[PDB]
């Protein structure tokens, strides 16, 4: 997250931190995710497409720090890793960038809700907030484009949803952004998601209820003028999500 604020997991209790184990025992952070039901985390396919081996991955819930334990945290294996079959990537744009991770502890248990671990609501079909709505993003991604390490503490920020008409402008993304994506950015281009924040949640307060409106997917640079963050439009993938859960 470029700019924004350091946060704690109680503020974002659906947030899932996803890591990959490497040959030789080193573990590295891969991507963010959102708990949509006790056994299911939703994320982005681009995060896993080059290493589609579910045994490699570790998922935490209840976790505020990148490389230290948090009280109440819970550690999971991936029982099922489901990537969208029509995923593709262009020069910038990523298509059908959505993934589901069925999680289980070593005891075979799914998530247990607590103060630091809760599910996020899915949106209803074709029900997104109006452009200009403020939504939040969360992640362990880079704070600056010059960083070569991720922050130790979880971050969040607030961005505004941008219309398809604006996002399709020539100096924005042209026809590279589609109606299955949402753009969101800061009017001053001072805050944004960045590399490492992929897969994580774009949460909007939608008719009273905190809703998973987007999944961090792509963008040209980070917090770059006229280059919003682009998000998987969750409300379009409900049938996909329902059949695979």
């Amino acid at each position: 997250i470029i700019g924004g604020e350091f946060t704690t997991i109680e503020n974002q209790p659906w947030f899932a931190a996803i890591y990959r184990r490497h040959r030789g025992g080193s573990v590295t952070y891969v991507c963010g995710g959102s708990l949509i039901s006790p056994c299911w985390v939703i994320s982005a396919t681009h995060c896993f497409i080059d290493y589609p081996k579910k045994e490699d991955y570790i998922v935490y819930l209840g976790r505020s720090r990148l490389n230290s334990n948090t009280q109440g945290e819970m550690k999971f294996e991936v029982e099922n890793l489901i990537l969208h079959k029509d995923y593709s990537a262009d020069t910038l744009a990523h298509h059908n960038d959505i993934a589901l991770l069925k999680i289980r502890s070593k005891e075979g248990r799914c998530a247990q809700p607590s103060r630091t671990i809760q599910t996020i609501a899915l949106p209803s079909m074709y029900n997104d907030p109006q452009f200009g709505t403020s939504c939040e993003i969360t992640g362990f991604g880079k704070e600056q484009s010059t960083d070569y390490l991720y922050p130790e503490q979880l971050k969040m920020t607030v961005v505004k949803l941008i219309s398809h008409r604006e996002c399709q402008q020539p100096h924005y993304y042209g026809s590279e952004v589609t109606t299955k994506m949402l753009c969101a950015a800061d009017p001053q281009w001072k805050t944004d998601s960045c590399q490492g924040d992929s897969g994580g949640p774009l949460v909007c307060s939608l008719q009273g209820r905190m809703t998973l409106t987007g999944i961090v997917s792509w963008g040209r640079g980070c917090a770059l003028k006229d280059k919003p963050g682009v998000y998987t439009r969750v409300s379009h993938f409900l049938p996909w999500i329902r059949s695979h859960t």
Partner: peptide
């Protein structure tokens, strides 16, 4: 990997 932006996490970049 690529370190070019969102979309590049956990990639094999030969």
């Amino acid at each position: 990997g690529x370190a070019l932006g969102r979309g590049c996490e956990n990639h094999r970049c030969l």
